Amino acid sequence: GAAILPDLGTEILIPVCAVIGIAFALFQWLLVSKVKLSAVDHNVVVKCAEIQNAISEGATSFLFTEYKYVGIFMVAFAILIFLFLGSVEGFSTSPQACSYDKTKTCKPALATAIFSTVSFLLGGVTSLVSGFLGMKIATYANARTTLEARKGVGKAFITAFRSGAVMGFLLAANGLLVLYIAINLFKIYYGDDWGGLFEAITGYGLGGSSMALFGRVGGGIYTKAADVGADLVGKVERNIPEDDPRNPAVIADNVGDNVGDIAGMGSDLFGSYAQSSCAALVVASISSFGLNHELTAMLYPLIVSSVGILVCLLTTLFATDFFEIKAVKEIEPALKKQLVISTVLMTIGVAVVSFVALPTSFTIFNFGVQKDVKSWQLFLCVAVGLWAGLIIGFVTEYYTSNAYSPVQDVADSCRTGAATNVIFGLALGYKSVIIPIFAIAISIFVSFTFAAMYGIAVAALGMLSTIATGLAIDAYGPISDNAGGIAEMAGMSHRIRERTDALDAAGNTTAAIGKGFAIGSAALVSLALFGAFVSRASITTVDVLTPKVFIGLIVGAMLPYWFSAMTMKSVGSAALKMVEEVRRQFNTIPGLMEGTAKPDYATCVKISTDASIKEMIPPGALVMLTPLVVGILFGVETLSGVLAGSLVSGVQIAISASNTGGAWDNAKKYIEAGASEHARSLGPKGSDCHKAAVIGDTIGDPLKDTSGPSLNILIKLMAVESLVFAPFFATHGGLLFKIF
Amino acid sequence: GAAILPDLGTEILIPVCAVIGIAFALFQWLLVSKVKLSAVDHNVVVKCAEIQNAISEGATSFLFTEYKYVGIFMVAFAILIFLFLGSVEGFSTSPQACSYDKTKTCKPALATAIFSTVSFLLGGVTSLVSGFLGMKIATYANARTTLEARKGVGKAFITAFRSGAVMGFLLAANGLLVLYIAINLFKIYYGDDWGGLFEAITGYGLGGSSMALFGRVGGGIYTKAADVGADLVGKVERNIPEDDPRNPAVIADNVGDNVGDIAGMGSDLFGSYAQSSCAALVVASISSFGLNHELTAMLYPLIVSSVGILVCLLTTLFATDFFEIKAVKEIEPALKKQLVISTVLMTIGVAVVSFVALPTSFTIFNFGVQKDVKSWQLFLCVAVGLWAGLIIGFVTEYYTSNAYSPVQDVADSCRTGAATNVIFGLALGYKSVIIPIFAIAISIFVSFTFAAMYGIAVAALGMLSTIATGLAIDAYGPISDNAGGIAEMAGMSHRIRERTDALDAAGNTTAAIGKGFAIGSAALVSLALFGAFVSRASITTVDVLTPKVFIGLIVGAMLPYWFSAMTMKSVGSAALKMVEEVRRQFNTIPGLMEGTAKPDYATCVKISTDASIKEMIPPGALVMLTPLVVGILFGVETLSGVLAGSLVSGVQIAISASNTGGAWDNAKKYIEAGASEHARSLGPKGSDCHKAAVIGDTIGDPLKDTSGPSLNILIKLMAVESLVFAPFFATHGGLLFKIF
Ligand SMILES: [K+]
Ligand SMILES: [K+]
Ligand SMILES: [Mg+2]
Ligand SMILES: [Mg+2]
Ligand SMILES: [Mg+2]
Ligand SMILES: [Mg+2]
Ligand SMILES: [Mg+2]
Ligand SMILES: [Mg+2]
Ligand SMILES: [Mg+2]
Ligand SMILES: [Mg+2]
Ligand SMILES: [Mg+2]
Ligand SMILES: [Mg+2]
Incomplete structure (x- = not known):
């Protein structure tokens, strides 16, 4: 049955909405350009611009090197x-x-082997463009956020958020436009074979998450080697402020915010968006939509994203035009409003799309059987994903913001030292998983029940339907983080650093929320891909109580720990070398501590460049070789086990790692700000409580910026990789069982 | 068909072997009594006796409180x-x-409802006896190990190890003899109904582990609150020796080793023994052995355990007589040789048993069908668990002993502070899971393929066929821990503490190893029980890709994190109280730091007692309520997912926690001993490196002694509980799906 909206409307609507999102992002970049600065107050403006250039050049240099290998x-x-x-x-x-x-x-x-290869390279290139563009805006707006901090928090907040929105709307509109274009190009060849068309298209998400695994791991190793080294010698050993220009690791640290937290993150989320769209597409492909060649209903996921951009655009205005921030206590609620507003507006949006782009009745492929589904049931599938995301954002804020007891109890535990700070931090993270898992399970139950693997796929996309906003609040963080590091390297007023610090602490919470959305959507999309994999590999039943499936399940469950071991050990070894380097400079360069001599920045940049490019490879290998190795040697049944186990296991450690690390950071920020008496009781900066907080903060650095957030990629990448190679595995795989 | 060994022979062999183990234990306790002391230098002998009585009183006191609630x-x-x-x-x-x-x-x-209740109480009571007896031998042997350290490590080694063997043989022979008696007593009623006989018998393991869960968590919280408190204030803050009699928390610390590391551990392992024997028995009961009323083959697992006692008796003689330790580097290899000899001897013993106690052909229940199985295939089932254990032992040694590079690098990482030490230690733990998981997977595959759930249960039992020895080398550790604690409190020479430190470091590895065995056998017995549950609940197929099963899976996988959140937080909070109390005494009691005034030990005992008796309840409730809540509300399918998820997910966190904490401990011991240039350069005691090591060690305390080791109980306990309540869930459960 055709829908109210005809195919031609859909063919127009989708790229129109994209260009709108592009136009809007370009527009926000323009308003941010209204902040003038050059390397030619005025003496401070010149210094900020010199520092920005050092960072910008360091960031561009690393991505070029990294993207070469990748x-x-x-x-x-x-x-x-x-x-x-x-x-x-x-x-x-x-x-x-x-x-x-x-x-x-x-x-x-x-x-199809050829068109899979094409869309894969499309996905890879779009993924790199995503992280690179995000870096370009971030390394442009950082000093602009510092300069606008001379006029209050509100002014600097806007600059940071407008710039986050630039990345948000650019990534989300570009990833949509490329997919839409690929689908129409591909269709020329495939004609009436939509099954093959969209089976080829799924390479797009495989491309996106593949080039994201390396950019998250590589970027995350670079940034955390510097972070730990700079902060340990600077703040714990030498008693100098954070981001002090005497500290030789500060440039690498601040560069690291852009190549990891921005570039890797942008790629990461592109992968999420792409896999979720493709998963939905691949199932609809062989349901009533694709069989009856009904283009509008077939492109329902792309129509949801289209409306998502418009909804996020209207949403953005509330934090950019309609409201101003007067008190630092208004920052976190402002950012959270963005989630609430977009969620509410998008519920209405999905309702409309569900009403105009779907027949009231259709069938959805369900393990060999066409299952009867109503459009109001599909509305609910998208909706549980959307609302599960909001729930996740709320619970994540509760456990990572210093406005609430969990993080304040962690800061408070610093009175008895680093050991208690860490125990409390670990326990907080473990505790934090409970509600997000429950939210995910509810989304799975509802969406699985209504529409099988397609429902789960559109639940994943639902959670990411507001991705422009999601990216905006997130990207806003590292921009603010750089803005504070620049203020301190520019030797600006203490009032400036206090403002950026307030913006920065909100960004910490905000980055944890982004990780929650990534982990939530990855759980959903991977489950859907798992189901599509099982069908494509022609498996009758994934029975848990068979030798083949169970060994896969327990081994798959082990993989996230193995991956975490590598990336933790890497940061640890690199940070150890960074500390030794920072110490060397402080102890041998005369006048350095005095402020008379210049530190050698380039040597610290090199330590984390060498370590990242070299050490990104084994965990990258582990994730990409596992489907191939298990599928070839052991077969599709065992790979089925690996996929389920790594999902349910990897998700727990991802959430706890990210939240633990986030809480340790904000506990530290709490002390550093001294905005309440309790906070002030743990200070001042330099106290034993403060240093204990810094210890926990630096342990959490790799947890939340290297291993933790890369785990969502590990899970969804293996899932999509498995689906793509399912015909190969089903035919030529299972070797060890054919031989013996 | 009957085996070579007639039923009446089996009826004799089993108790004779149990009586031999009990006589052996008593003999060793007798020889240990030859070390004399009384509280009525000669002052050194008197001071050791007083300290021992203060520890004995404290440990007997706490268990009475704990066991009363339990x-x-x-x-x-x-x-x-x-x-x-x-x-x-x-x-x-x-x-x-x-x-x-x-x-x-x-x-x-x-x-069967009645006899299930009876066997439950039997198992619970036996579990309590197991822990209490272990505590009584440990609190008898500790000061005798101290006095014997005056003659050298060898002498001290012998008394500690003889004593650990007292516990090992008492617990193994007691667990065996009680189970033998219950089976014969129940048989008077059940007659030819062996199915119901053994279905009732499975409450034995349920009672065993129910009680172990509280003994492990309760004792674990008690000991770790003291430990962290004593160590942070005394060692990091006040710069005094570990276990210094001035430190008010030292008595509770050392009572703790008997109350957690001994009594908790003893109950824990008893539950493992009981569940594995019981898991094998139920499956056999409705296989050809039980259907044909062939007693000898029915009691195959008990005959294996009978032989293990004898094998371990012999093995014990190699560490007890045939060899003298004369140098500290010989302790670990002696300990490791125990595992090696027992394993080799038991391989032979299991071959003999498989030859005389089984018919060459028989059938094993395999989800409704009688599967043809051969006796050499069964031999391989128990042998693959037996050998997986040793592998786990070797790998665990490699990751927790300071004689190898992993831990030495962790210690080395202290040179850059507590943050790097923690990152290296966490990474080490994550890394450590890989081989054990593969070993478990191989064991599952082999035993599953040959003999389904019975094969699997019998592999778990195989892993624990040498449990007398396993307990012996393990119980050896906390005894050696107390010995150095007593030596320091008694003011004995530096040379005594040096010998005990060498004994105690080996105990840290040996404790990690025992944990490895508990986690390994837990995975195996749980999977067997999972499969029995599924049949008992009349589930046709546990299909991962159904809404009901998958939500159980992802929720099940989260439970071990929820559980770790609770226990970590408890220890963190009680430790924080302990620190406050210790600081208070040092800061306000005139003459304390000077050694002219005595501290208040009782107050610290009270803080540990109050926190552990209270906070053991919620994690206990989480484990025991989960099957009931899920089975009653969601039904057996969902509970299936929960059983699989908590299994594959829980083992990862149990292994990484236990090993990380172990590594942190021995990395510290390595610095404290200065037995090489590298170790010395990290010292001396009180250096920044040492203190970084102590920080890591104290974070590891709750990881390895509260949360980590209890996780194997969480996993295996839910599995027996689900099986026992399976008929009830299948009939009256799944309400939410019946209502709607
Ligand atoms: K941040
Ligand atoms: K120990
Ligand atoms: Mg930092
Ligand atoms: Mg940063
Ligand atoms: Mg920063
Ligand atoms: Mg931060
Ligand atoms: Mg950081
Ligand atoms: Mg200690
Ligand atoms: Mg101890
Ligand atoms: Mg001790
Ligand atoms: Mg120890
Ligand atoms: Mg300890």
Whole structure:
């Protein structure tokens, strides 16, 4: 059944909304350019601009180096996709029976091996463009946020948030436009074979998350080596302020906010967006929508994202035009309003899209059977994902903001030293998982029940339907974080650093919230892909109580720990070398501590550049080799176990790591600000409580910026990778069981 | 068909072997009594006796308090068991057709409800005896180990190890003999109805682990609050030795080792022994052994345990007589040789047992079907668990002993502060899970394939066939811990503490190893019980990709994190109180720091007692209520997911926590001993490195002694509980799906 909105309306609506989001982001970049500064007050403006240039050059330099390796890996792995998928029907040029309906004839499997390779490289390139653009705006707006901090918090907040929105709307409108364009290009070849079209398209998400795994790990290693080294020697050993220009690791630290927290994060979320859209597409592909070639209903996920951009645009105005921040206590509530407003507005949006872009009745593929589904049931699938996200944001704020007891109790535990600070921090993180898991389970139950794997996929997209806003609040953070580091390197007034610090602490909470959305959506989308994988691999039942599935389940559950071991050990080893370097400079360069001599920044940049590029590779290998190794040697049943186990296991450590690290940071920020008497009782900066907080903060650095947030990528990447290679695994895999 | 070993022989062999183990234990306790002391230098002998009595009194006191609460919970829960099980057939007294053979009449379900309650209480009481006896031997051997340290490590080693063996053989022979007696007593009633005989018997393990959960958590909180408090204030703050008699928290610290590391541990391992034997028995009971009433083969697991006692007796003689330690580097290898010899001897013993106690062919129940199994396949089932254990032992040694690079690098990482020490230690723990998980997976695959759930249960039992020795080397540790604690409190020479420190470091590794075995066997027995549950609940297929199962899976996987949040927070909070109290005495009691005034030990004992008796309740409730809540509300399918999820997810956190904490401890011991240039450069005691090590160690305290080791109980306890209540859930559960 056709919908109210005709195919031509949809063909127009989607890219119109994208260009709108692009226009809007370009516009926000313009308003941010209204803040003038050059390296030619005035003496302070010149210094800020010199510091920005140092950071901007350091950031661009690292991404270029990083993307070189990753681009090469991108090219190599694309050959593997062509070869393995092409080998399914021996590289035949002949058409064959449809995988989904043996009464019909489909395009040759080799064409699909080729179009998978193309969309993969599309996804890889879009992923790199995402993180790179985000870096460009972030390294542009940081000093602009510092300069506007001379006029109050509100003025600096806007600059930071407008700039976060630039990244938000650019990433979200570009990822949509490319997908839409790819789908229409692909359709030219595939014609009536939508099954093959969208099976090819799923390479897009595989491309996105592949180039994101390396950018999150590599970026995260770079940034945390510097962070730990700068803060330990600077603040704990030498009693100098954070981000002090004497500290040789400060440039690498602040560069690191852009190459990890911004660039890697942008790629990470692009992967999430792309996989969730593609997952929905691949199931609709072989449900009534794709079989009846109903284009509008087929592109329902892209229509939801389209409305999401408009909703997020109106939402953004509330924090950019309609309201101003007068007290620092208004920052976190302002950012949270963004989530609440977008969630409420988008519920209405999805209601409308569900009403105009869907027939009231259709069928959804359900493990070999066309299942009857109503459009109001699909509305609820998108909606549970959307609201689960908001719930996750709220619980995450509660456990990571210093406006509430959990983080204040952690700061408070500093009176008895670093050991109690850490025990309390760990326990907080563990505790934090409870509600998010419950929210995820409710989303799974509701959406699985109504619409099977498609429902779960659109629940994932629901949670990410507000991604422009989500990215905006998140990106706002590292921009504020740089703004404070620049203020201190520029030797500005203490009132400036206090303002940026308030903006920064809100960004800490905000970045934890972003991790929650990433982990929540990854859980949902991976589950949906898992289901699609099982179908595509022609498995009758994934029975937990079979030797093959169970070994996969327990081994898959171990993988997130293995991955965490590597990345933790890497940061630890790199930070250890950074500390030794910072100490060397302080102890051998005369006048450095005195303020007479310049530190050698480039040496610290090198330590974390060398460590990141080298050490990003094994965890990257572990994630990408696991589907291939298990699928080839052990078979699709065992890989099924690996996927379920790594999902339910990886999710727990991801959440606890991110929240623990976030809480330790904000506990530290609490002490540093001294905005209440309790906070003031743990101070001043330099006290034993403050230093204990800093210890916990630096332990949490790799937890929340390297291992923790990369875990969502590990889970969803393996899931999509498994689906893509399912025909190959089902045919040529299971080797060890065929031999013995 | 009958085995070579006739039923009457088996009836004799088993108790004879239990009596041999009990006689051996008594003999060792006798030889240990040859070390004389009394409280009535010669002052050194007197001071040791007074300190020992203060520790004995404290430990006997706490367990009485703890066991009183637990014994009351036990009685209540036993009523719950009777009521819920009896309600399945409305408490009818009428016999019904046997589920395993409709041509036969079985005893009423009501009788099984009664005998299940009886076996539950038996297991609970035996668990309590196990922990209490262990505490009584440990608190008898501690000061005798101190006095013998005057003659050297070798002498001290012998008394500590002889004593650990007292516990090991008493616990193994007692667990065995009680189970043998219960089976014969229940048989008087059940007659030919072996299915019901052994279904009732499974409450034994349920009682064993129910009580162990509280003994582990309660004792664990008690000891760790003291430990962290004593260590932080005394060592990091006040710069005094560890276990210094001036420190008010030292008595509670050392009582703690007996109350947690001994009594808790003893109950814990008893539950493992009981569940594995019971898991094997239920499956055999409705296989050919039970269907054909072949006693010898039915009691195969008990015969294996009978032989293990004898094997371990021999093995013990190698560390007790045939070899003398004369140098500190020989302690760990002696300890490791215990595992090696027992494993090799038991491989032979298990071969002999498999040859004389089984018919060459038989059938094992396999989800409704009788699976043809051969006796050499069964030999391999128990042998693969036996050998997986040793691998776990070797790998765990490699990660927790300061003789190897992992821990030495952790210690080395102290050179850059507490933050790096914590990052390295966490990474070490994560890294450590890999081989054990693979070892468990291999064991599952082999034993699952050959003999389904019975094979799996029998592999778990295999892993614990050498439990007398396993307990011996383990119990050796806390005894050695107290010995150095007593030596310091007694003001004995530096040389004595040096010998005890060498004994105690080996104990840290040995404690990690015991944890490895408990987690390994927990995974195995839980999976077997999971499978039995599924049949008992008449579940046709546990399909991962159904809404009901998957939500159980993701929620199940979260439970171990919820549990770790609670226990970590408890210790953190009680430790924070302990620190405040210790600081108060040092700061306000004139003459304390000077050693002319005595501290108030009792107040610290009271803080540990109050926190542990209170805060053991919620995590205990989380474990025991979960099957009931899920089974009653959501039904057996969902509970299935929960059983799988908590298994695969819980083992990862249990392994990484135990090993990280172990590594932090021995990294500290390495610095404290200065037995090489590298270790010395990190010292001396009181250096910034040492204090960084102490910070790591104290964070590790609750990880490895409260949360970590209790996790194996969480996993395995929910598994027996689900099986025991399975008929009740299958019939009266799943309400939320019945209402709607
Ligand atoms: K941040
Ligand atoms: K120990
Ligand atoms: Mg920092
Ligand atoms: Mg930063
Ligand atoms: Mg910063
Ligand atoms: Mg921060
Ligand atoms: Mg940081
Ligand atoms: Mg201690
Ligand atoms: Mg101790
Ligand atoms: Mg001790
Ligand atoms: Mg120890
Ligand atoms: Mg300790």
